[PDB]
Design a protein around this ligand. Structure first.
Ligand code: NI
Length: 341
């Protein structure tokens, strides 16, 4: 059974609710982004209307084989009527194709559903500027002040400089980058651009990237592993054993691996600066964990919400424990007393 925080009151709509069977009263199922916790339940046998971005719809058709007749892609930043209700999709600054949804209810209430997002001051000049929001359904993944991390730009600067130094010292080093979902493509694309290489990967991952509308992508990626000195591998293989095994397969072309694991936050963020990050090393293998986030830090979240000034907040993450729920409610009240709404 579908939880309340996935239903939009006064509509026939649900958000990210495909694992509950046929939801009573649902006339349109929205999907914010193509991550498995959110699409859980979708397949070629789905026969209800799915509303989403163009990029999410390419992934639904090619990767999950959803039939074309049920995919309803909407342009961004454009007022659209769905089943008699005005909606707008906005860029969530999460993974490719990820959106927030603005619903203009027939009674006059306005609801923002963030999906998964990384709040940014650029959102203060979207179509959100133009009117008031009564209810905010908020991605609270890192809603506590311990969760700090650098800008995506500082993290990419670190990765490019680290990879370029290593491969210039040793032209026989291979760079490997972990992945287990869409998102964080800038990591491997930026490193391959500074090295003058295409990115090599499996046919399955190549197919996924081909659905993302990235400009000039045919110039940047390949399935020919032998032609590339930046390889993608599943995140589970980014360990000394899995990397040793990979290096065997490259037929003596390389004599060193430098590998990256983009994580979210880790507790080494509570002590260390990005500049000071060091790898784990075993012999001719080194592994860097880099804190590349596609979710809001605590401070970015708090700025967005203090700007938006919603009348009510409904968290969509960390809702399963009383301790988490009580923590989140305390920060919401601080924010409101500090800003005066
Ligand atoms: Ni996500």
């Amino acid at each position: 059974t579908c939880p309340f925080y996935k239903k939009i009151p006064g509509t026939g709509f649900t958000v990210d609710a495909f694992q509950y069977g046929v939801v009573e009263g649902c006339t349109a199922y929205f999907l914010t982004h193509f991550h498995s916790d959110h699409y859980a339940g979708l397949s070629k046998h789905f026969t209800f209307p799915v509303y989403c971005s163009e990029i999410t719809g390419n992934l639904l058709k090619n990767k999950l084989h959803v039939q074309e007749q049920y995919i309803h892609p909407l342009p961004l930043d454009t007022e659209c009527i769905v089943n008699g209700v005005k909606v707008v999709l906005l860029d969530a600054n999460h993974c490719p194709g990820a959106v927030m949804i603005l619903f203009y209810l027939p009674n006059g209430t306005v609801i923002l559903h963030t999906g998964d997002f990384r709040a940014d001051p650029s959102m203060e000049r979207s179509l959100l500027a133009d009117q008031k929001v009564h209810m905010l359904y908020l991605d609270t993944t890192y809603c506590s002040p311990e969760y700090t991390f650098p800008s995506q730009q500082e993290v990419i600067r670190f990765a490019i400089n680290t990879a370029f130094e290593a491969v210039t010292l040793n032209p026989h080093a291979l760079v490997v980058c972990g992945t287990y979902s869409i998102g964080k493509e800038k990591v491997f694309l930026a490193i391959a651009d500074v090295l003058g290489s295409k990115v090599g990967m499996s046919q399955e991952k190549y197919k996924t990237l081909q659905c993302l509308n990235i400009p000039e992508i045919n110039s940047l990626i390949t399935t020919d592993m032998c032609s590339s000195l930046v390889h993608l591998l599943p995140m589970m293989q980014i360990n000394f054993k899995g990397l040793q095994s990979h290096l065997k397969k490259c037929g003596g072309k390389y004599n060193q691996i430098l590998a990256f694991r983009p994580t979210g936050w880790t507790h080494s963020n509570k002590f260390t600066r990005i500049a000071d990050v060091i790898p784990q090393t075993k012999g001719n293998i080194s592994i860097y964990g880099i804190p590349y986030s596609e979710h809001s830090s605590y401070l970015e979240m708090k700025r967005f919400v203090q700007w938006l000034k919603p009348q009510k907040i409904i968290p969509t993450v960390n809702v399963g424990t009383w301790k988490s729920r009580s923590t989140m409610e305390k920060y919401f009240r601080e924010w409101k007393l500090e800003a005066g709404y």
